[PDB]
């Protein structure tokens, strides 16, 4: 009754994924249209089983460049904002040192 | 019988001594100790377990063994060593979960604590921590609980990097979900001990050796500078994740509104200054949303709200948030506190004994720079005297002593006073201004010393 | 005649949520719809502290609550953003 037996997930960290995720959630781009747009020249280049010397240079070079929207960029900055990113000291003395640098 | 036990103890001592002298060459002796532990005698089981603990702590490296003759045999040695250590731990959960036998369980807890204190950095620490916390997650204080919490507290203090603390915090959080955030109050105090959050002639060298020595020295200096920067960043990231897990546990505890609200507000007040500014403004909303032991809980909310506002530099960071709603809550809560009884017995913000926070909230209220004594303190103090009709005299003398040492020169507090606004329910006496009640009745009271306390007040 | 209808896959639809005041002004035929009460400040603080998996940060104009990707939407985003067939069982 105390067993720690505790799967697959995903972590949206790229601007590309956020723009796609925003389009899915905001319903601006229809989900059915997104699926159809996913049958392109790059999805048919399957990566299942390819070696690491091949896959590494395929990702750095042969990676389709999807657009990025400013709204998704803000969302990532919001996600990347840690709980202690701007505490009382890092907002007061950090602001104070810059102020006294400008004064000097 | 006794001779057999003595012979087995001697054999364990000889095997242990040989291991200390030559650890690498005698790995089979550890297997022999396990066979000796298999003896039915309880005392021999205890001695074998202790010798295994002593042997393991002596031969365990000070570094983390990196998994896979000068290098190969060392790897086989370390791989072989890990196998007994796993087997020894496997016996540990078996005997721990199996709970005469109580003494063996206490010994089992003891070696578990010793491994925690010393072998925290080593492999299988995830299993070691999980076994120990599983004993604490239970409703009742099992034997050795004081030893385990001390060991966990010591690790949190020494762990400057915060990786081991992060592992324990995650495991402690998992128990809280399993227990529905219903554990002993001492358990939540572990988070308070996280040091990461609380931090807020010469031998001759050949011509070739000198160039090697110089080359290594340059690497070490470059290694140190990069490590220092990496340590600062990793500690900062670990601190953020620890705050994430700790605060999410505290907020979940507040949502359930259990009996552990005391420790949750304790942690929230202690770690509030570590959190972001935007969260400070929204932190008081959850405190003020619980107004529909109800008086005791409201005391914690108003006291913690005072503590959060007490953070240095709030004047520069004008977050406002109008803590006056908490002020009026304290202004109204004194009457039910005077209504219900209270007993100190004999031998949660920061302490216990509810009367202690009240004076503590009053003294931080007084410690506020010019925030009071603007004819508002007197109105507050009047009901303070009214609420002082009961409770021990030392408490009664304490609150009267607060206004005695008060810098304000107002003297009409214990008599007719200016308008008693802010929820009223008392004599207003508007626009009176007369230097002319409660002490007269206070003189007649069970304890004789209240009479002289009233006399010393009117004379002073 | 062609009935001037809307097929279920038409790119035109009502209620287009956007990023972040709440756009609770009126409804069709012009009636104010009730504002859903603001969420418990505890619960809102929890969600802010630990963002839900697939936290899009998108609120529909009607309800002030955020819109979060479901498990199937998270899977579709996984396949689409990794440039694979968005169909789990399609023979390439």
From Swiss-Prot, chain A:
Similarity-based family: Belongs to the class I-like SAM-binding methyltransferase superfamily. RNA methyltransferase RlmE family. SPB1 subfamily.
Protein's gene: spb1
Residues included from the entire protein: 608 to 713 of 802
Known partners and oligomeric status: Component of the nucleolar and nucleoplasmic pre-60S ribosomal particle.
Subcellular location: Nucleus, Nucleolus
UniProt signal peptide: none
Stated role: Required for proper assembly of pre-ribosomal particles during the biogenesis of the 60S ribosomal subunit.
Name this protein carries in UniProt: AdoMet-dependent rRNA methyltransferase spb1
Domain of life per record: Eukaryota
From Swiss-Prot, chain B:
GO cellular component, one term: nucleolus
An annotated Gene Ontology molecular function: chromatin binding
Keyword Transport: no
Part of the whole protein covered: 213 to 744 of 747
Coiled coil: 2-22
Keywords: Coiled coil, Nucleus, Phosphoprotein, Ribosome biogenesis
Top-level taxon of the source organism: Eukaryota
Task of the protein: May be required for synthesis of 60S ribosomal subunits and the transport of pre-ribosomes from the nucleoplasm to the cytoplasm.
Identification of the protein by name: Nucleolar complex-associated protein 3
Subcellular location field: Nucleus, Nucleolus
Family as reported in the entry's similarity comment: Belongs to the CBF/MAK21 family.
UniProt keyword Amino-acid biosynthesis, yes or no: no
Underlying gene: noc3
Record GO biological process: DNA replication initiation; rRNA processing
Curated annotation (Swiss-Prot), chain C:
Subcellular location: Nucleus, Nucleolus; Nucleus, Nucleoplasm
Residue ranges the record marks as coiled coil: none
Subunit note: Component of the NOP7 complex, composed of erb1, ppp1/nop7 and ytm1/SPAC890.04c. The complex is held together by erb1, which interacts with ppp1/nop7 via its N-terminal domain and with ytm1/SPAC890.04c via a high-affinity interaction between the seven-bladed beta-propeller domains of the 2 proteins. The NOP7 complex associates with the 66S pre-ribosome.
Family statement drawn from the similarity comment of this UniProt entry: Belongs to the WD repeat BOP1/ERB1 family.
Function of the molecule: Component of the NOP7 complex, which is required for maturation of the 25S and 5.8S ribosomal RNAs and formation of the 60S ribosome.
Name assigned to this protein: Ribosome biogenesis protein erb1
Native organism: Schizosaccharomyces pombe (strain 972 / ATCC 24843) (Fission yeast)
Gene: erb1
Residues of the full protein shown: 101 to 198 of 740
